[PDB]
Amino acid sequence: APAAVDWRARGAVTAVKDQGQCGSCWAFSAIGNVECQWFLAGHPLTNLSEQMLVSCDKTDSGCSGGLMNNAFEWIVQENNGAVYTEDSYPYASGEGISPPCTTSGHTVGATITGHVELPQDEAQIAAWLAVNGPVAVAVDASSWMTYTGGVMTSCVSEQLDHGVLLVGYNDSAAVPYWIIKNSWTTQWGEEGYIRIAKGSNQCLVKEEASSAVVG
Amino acid sequence: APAAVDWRARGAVTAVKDQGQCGSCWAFSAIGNVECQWFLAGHPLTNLSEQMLVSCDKTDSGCSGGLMNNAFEWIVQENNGAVYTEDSYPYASGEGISPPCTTSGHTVGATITGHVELPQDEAQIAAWLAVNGPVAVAVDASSWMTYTGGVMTSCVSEQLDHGVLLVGYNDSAAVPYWIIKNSWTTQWGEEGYIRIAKGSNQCLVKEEASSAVVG
Amino acid sequence: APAAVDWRARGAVTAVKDQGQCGSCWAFSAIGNVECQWFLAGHPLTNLSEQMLVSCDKTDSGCSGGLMNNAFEWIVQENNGAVYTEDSYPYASGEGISPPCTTSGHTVGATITGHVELPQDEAQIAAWLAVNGPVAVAVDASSWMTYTGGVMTSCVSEQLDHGVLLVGYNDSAAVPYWIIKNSWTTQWGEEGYIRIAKGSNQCLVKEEASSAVVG
Amino acid sequence: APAAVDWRARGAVTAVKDQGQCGSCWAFSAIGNVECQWFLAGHPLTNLSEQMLVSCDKTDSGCSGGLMNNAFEWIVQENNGAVYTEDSYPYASGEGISPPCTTSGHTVGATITGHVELPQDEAQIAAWLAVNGPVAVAVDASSWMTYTGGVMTSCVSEQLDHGVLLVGYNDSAAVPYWIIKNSWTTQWGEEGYIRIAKGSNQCLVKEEASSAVVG
Numbered sequence: 001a002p003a004a005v006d007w008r009a010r011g012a013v014t015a016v017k018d019q020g021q022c023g024s025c026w027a028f029s030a031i032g033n034v035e036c037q038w039f040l041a042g043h044p045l046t047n048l049s050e051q052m053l054v055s056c057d058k059t060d061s062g063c064s065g066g067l068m069n070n071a072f073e074w075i076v077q078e079n080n081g082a083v084y085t086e087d088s089y090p091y092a093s094g095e096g097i098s099p100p101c102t103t104s105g106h107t108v109g110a111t112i113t114g115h116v117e118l119p120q121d122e123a124q125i126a127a128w129l130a131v132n133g134p135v136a137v138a139v140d141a142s143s144w145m146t147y148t149g150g151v152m153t154s155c156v157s158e159q160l161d162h163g164v165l166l167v168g169y170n171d172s173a174a175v176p177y178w179i180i181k182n183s184w185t186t187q188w189g190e191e192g193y194i195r196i197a198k199g200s201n202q203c204l205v206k207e208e209a210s211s212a213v214v215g
Numbered sequence: 216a217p218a219a220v221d222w223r224a225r226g227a228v229t230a231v232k233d234q235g236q237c238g239s240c241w242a243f244s245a246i247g248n249v250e251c252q253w254f255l256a257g258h259p260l261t262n263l264s265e266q267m268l269v270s271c272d273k274t275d276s277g278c279s280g281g282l283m284n285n286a287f288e289w290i291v292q293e294n295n296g297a298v299y300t301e302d303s304y305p306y307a308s309g310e311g312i313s314p315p316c317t318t319s320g321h322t323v324g325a326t327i328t329g330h331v332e333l334p335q336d337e338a339q340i341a342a343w344l345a346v347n348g349p350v351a352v353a354v355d356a357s358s359w360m361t362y363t364g365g366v367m368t369s370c371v372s373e374q375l376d377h378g379v380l381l382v383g384y385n386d387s388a389a390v391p392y393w394i395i396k397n398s399w400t401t402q403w404g405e406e407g408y409i410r411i412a413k414g415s416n417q418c419l420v421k422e423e424a425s426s427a428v429v430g
Numbered sequence: 431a432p433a434a435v436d437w438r439a440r441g442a443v444t445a446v447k448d449q450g451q452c453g454s455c456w457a458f459s460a461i462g463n464v465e466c467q468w469f470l471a472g473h474p475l476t477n478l479s480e481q482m483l484v485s486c487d488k489t490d491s492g493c494s495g496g497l498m499n500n501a502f503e504w505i506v507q508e509n510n511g512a513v514y515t516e517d518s519y520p521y522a523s524g525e526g527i528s529p530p531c532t533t534s535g536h537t538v539g540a541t542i543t544g545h546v547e548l549p550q551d552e553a554q555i556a557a558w559l560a561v562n563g564p565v566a567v568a569v570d571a572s573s574w575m576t577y578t579g580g581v582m583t584s585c586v587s588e589q590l591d592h593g594v595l596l597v598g599y600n601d602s603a604a605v606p607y608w609i610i611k612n613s614w615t616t617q618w619g620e621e622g623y624i625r626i627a628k629g630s631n632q633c634l635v636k637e638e639a640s641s642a643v644v645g
Numbered sequence: 646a647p648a649a650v651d652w653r654a655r656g657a658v659t660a661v662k663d664q665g666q667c668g669s670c671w672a673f674s675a676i677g678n679v680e681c682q683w684f685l686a687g688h689p690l691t692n693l694s695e696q697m698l699v700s701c702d703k704t705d706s707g708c709s710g711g712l713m714n715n716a717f718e719w720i721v722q723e724n725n726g727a728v729y730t731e732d733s734y735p736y737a738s739g740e741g742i743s744p745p746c747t748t749s750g751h752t753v754g755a756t757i758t759g760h761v762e763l764p765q766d767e768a769q770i771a772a773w774l775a776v777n778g779p780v781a782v783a784v785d786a787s788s789w790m791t792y793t794g795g796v797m798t799s800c801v802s803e804q805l806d807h808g809v810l811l812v813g814y815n816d817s818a819a820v821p822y823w824i825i826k827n828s829w830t831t832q833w834g835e836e837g838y839i840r841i842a843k844g845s846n847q848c849l850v851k852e853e854a855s856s857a858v859v860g
């Protein structure tokens with residue numbers, strides 16, 4: 001695999017978002033992935049709708065949490081692959097209240113056909129990401145509360161509690177790392193990103209990695 | 216049952232606490248309940264150790280959440296019924312990182328023999344509370360992000376995601392209410408407290424109500 | 431016992447010192463204690479000689495460590511209670527090399543008759559300190575490396591590796607604490623001092639507490 | 646035996662590391678030795694995990710010190726001979742706080758079958774090193790605080806307090822010397838290395854010499 005990949009440098013990643021006071025991390029992770037995958041299939045980079053999942057995906061729990069794999073399955077099984085644009089279904093849950101699901105008035109921004117669940121193996125995840133793009137991953141982010149920068153080497157890795165987006169890695173660095181897009185504004189971490197050490201299952205990063213399929 | 220009960224007025228409730236940047240609400244709810252039950256058995260009101268649970272209760276998940284019933288069971292089945300004083304096992308997870316469990320150097324503040332799981336019935340919970348004191352309850356607190364006061368009447372009631380403590384109710388008010396101790400400092404809500412309407416299962420307040428037993 | 435005691439406020443404690451690049455913490459702890467005890471017996475507060483112990487106490491290991499209880503025993507058993515002044519036997523080990531022991535040319539600043547080893551009980555240590563003054567204590571100080579201030583509530587308490595001086599406590603504070611004099615200059619911690627939480631055997635503070643006797 | 650051996654010139658020695666503000670020298674010495682022995686068995690030179698030992702070896706005391714022989718025994722008796730790669734269990738104790746042991750998420754980099762404890766004889770250690778490679782040694786390093794280069798001839802040799810790695814010697818020099826890898830960055834001494842005189846038991850270098858066995 002390549003020494004280092006940063007999908008942000010390649011123009012594949014939209015701006016860092018703000019889930020606000022809502023446990024919709026799972027929706028931001030799934031949607032960030034679909035955004036990247038749509039772009040990598042040759043379409044323009046476009047912001048897609050977290051609100052669509054938060055309000056409409058009833059297999060997950062809105063501001064009280066969910067699972068990216070559930071979200072992908074809902075998009076395919078219950079929404080026939082359609083993901084609305086952010087512009088036509090904008091985020092409304094920043095104060096913890098999710099408005100009822102609506103269908104009419106929204107514009108489809110991307111279509112997915114399925115999702116893959118990747119091996120629980122960091123080398124394999126890295127090799128897949130290099131060829132196929134950013135990967136939705138569950139993490140234990142309980143120890144991320146005071147992160148301001150650097151490569152994290154003792155992330156508490158005990159309970160998956162968060163969803164985020166793997167956008168790259170660097171295997172040449174003195175401490176190899178993953179690059180991760182968070183959804184806690186650009187004021188958090190490194191302009192909204194975190195580097196965690198790569199190769200030691202920091203934050204349980206390898207446990208539940210997946211991606212939408214546009215193919 | 217009485218028209219209104221307020222266990223705070225009776226000196227049965229310790230100060231409002233701060234869980235900080237840690238999903239330890241479950242522990243704050245269990246411990247609040249034990250503090251109150253211990254006082255109600257004739258003992259001085261004493262602050263007890265949330266950290267004991269967060270660090271040592273491996274049937275729950277520290278800053279990534281847990282269940283008050285699991286917490287009551289762990290105390291009895293793994294800790295000989297013992298609950299340490301706050302001052303002997305001080306809270307240190309406020310930045311999201313829990314110290315490792317230590318079995319040594321702590322002082323028993325209260326002892327419990329078990330717990331009771333109350334009917335999913337607000338009237339019966341009220342009656343139990345009037346006689347037996349504050350009750351640990353799970354709630355949907357997803358819609359509590361902007362609350363500064365008054366009686367909450369439109370609580371989003373979809374997913375249990377939080378643990379708090381019922382400390383009283385008022386059936387005489389124009390809109391009858393529960394009085395609830397939160398663990399988000401005295402800055403949140405009504406000096407740390409929330410009133411939610413009583414009789415409409417606001418926030419799913421009746422779904423998982425329980426209390427330690429000191430007797 | 432008193433709510434709070436600070437022997438510094440009472441004029442019983444000499445300036446914060448610098449052991450330099452030498453593991454003579456044990457000598458600084460023992461000597462700080464003798465300094466305080468001499469003052470409290472009605473003598474002027476005077477700086478005494480760490481170098482005397484580092485060079486001459488062959489039951490301990492100079493810049494490679496020692497035990498305060500050994501140091502007190504050496505002063506009594508091998509030096510017939512005598513402790514030289516700092517001025518006449520000044521500290522010379524700041525670069526890790528301890529000069530050979532000398533006897534002539536030094537001036538006795540204090541005399542001790544023995545030492546007491548206090549119970550492994552923080553309440554008891556506090557009550558003794560209130561009446562009898564600062565107490566030499568062994569601690570696990572491995573987790574003190576980035577301490578800049580505040581009351582420490584999750585001190586790693588695993589292995590006694592350091593000697594320091596208990597100069598006070600405050601039981602009225604929201605988080606009760608001990609006040610401890612370190613020997614790492616005034617640039618470290620709170621002008622050379624640390625507050626650790628009191629009542630939870632932080633840093634194993636209760637395990638090996640002792641004092642010289644001037645009586 | 647050869648006139649001079651330098652295992653660095655032969656590519657058998659990894660980069661000089663930094664223990665940071667943690668008394669983990671014992672672990673750096675044990676791990677340095679394993680790295681070298683693993684390479685010398687025909688395998689690629691690989692950085693291995695000091696953190697594995699610091700966190701998980703409970704027969705030693707993490708940042709408060711330990712013994713290389715204890716470390717070799719723990720690897721074999723408690724870890725099935727396995728030593729994880731650095732990149733799979735990265736060092737995170739540099740500020741003096743060791744993360745808890747994790748048994749999961751690591752990758753075996755080397756395996757050992759035991760260790761040998763060498764004679765307290767510098768000539769025999771030299772001969773063993775020429776044939777079998779770098780040797781873990783305990784030293785009195787109390788007098789190493791100002792060292793910037795040259796051959797140390799007056800090392801304070803009183804108390805074993807440090808663990809380092811013999812990587813070579815030169816019997817041809819006007820003053821014969823040992824070559825020693827320290828773990829205090831490349832900023833200390835000779836790009837991280839110290840030369841001490843050979844033949845006078847400098848720093849007590851002959852007292853506790855040992856090496857893992859890969860065979």
Ligand SMILES: *[C@H](CS(=O)(=O)c1ccccc1)[C@H](CCc1ccccc1)NC(=O)[C@H](Cc1ccccc1)NC(=O)N1CCN(C)CC1
Pocket residue numbers: 019022023024025026060061063064065066067068138141142160161162163208376377
């Ligand atoms: C997003 C995580 S967060 O809020 O950004 C955060 C905050 C602080 C520290 C770490 C993370 C949500 C939070 C959900 C929540 C909100 C309020 C109260 C309780 C919970 N986390 C999730 O959605 C996780 C993500 C996840 C994805 C894949 C695998 C494992 C976990 N899932 C989750 O919380 N749930 C809970 C209940 N639901 C039915 C199952 C999934």
Ligand SMILES: *[C@H](CS(=O)(=O)c1ccccc1)[C@H](CCc1ccccc1)NC(=O)[C@H](Cc1ccccc1)NC(=O)N1CCN(C)CC1
Pocket residue numbers: 161162237238239240241275276278279280281282283353354356357375376377378423
């Ligand atoms: C406390 C709730 S909170 O953080 O104060 C909060 C914040 C905003 C809105 C609502 C509530 C914790 C939060 C746990 C968490 C942290 C970070 C990421 C994900 C989750 N909530 C719990 O501990 C709940 C309480 C509960 C008790 C009884 C019944 C139902 C819920 N339990 C909980 O989250 N879990 C999740 C995982 N665990 C293994 C099972 C219990």
Ligand SMILES: *[C@H](CS(=O)(=O)c1ccccc1)[C@H](CCc1ccccc1)NC(=O)[C@H](Cc1ccccc1)NC(=O)N1CCN(C)CC1
Pocket residue numbers: 449452453454455456490491493494495496497498568571572590591592593638806807
């Ligand atoms: C002082 C501690 S320190 O150097 O200020 C320090 C630094 C960083 C973190 C924590 C503490 C000394 C250090 C001795 C040392 C130096 C160099 C290499 C190895 C060790 N510590 C001691 O002197 C302790 C104190 C003590 C007192 C009472 C009870 C328990 C411990 N004692 C000690 O180290 N030893 C070692 C060998 N000696 C024969 C027995 C006591």
Ligand SMILES: *[C@H](CS(=O)(=O)c1ccccc1)[C@H](CCc1ccccc1)NC(=O)[C@H](Cc1ccccc1)NC(=O)N1CCN(C)CC1
Pocket residue numbers: 591592667668669670671705706708709710711712713783784786787805806807808853
């Ligand atoms: C590493 C040595 S160091 O910190 O790099 C150093 C610094 C200055 C001068 C000399 C050396 C550690 C230091 C441990 C320590 C930290 C803080 C307070 C007290 C001690 N030293 C050790 O781990 C030594 C090494 C050793 C190996 C083999 C034989 C003899 C010594 N061992 C050690 O200190 N201990 C103490 C306690 N432990 C239970 C037994 C081994």
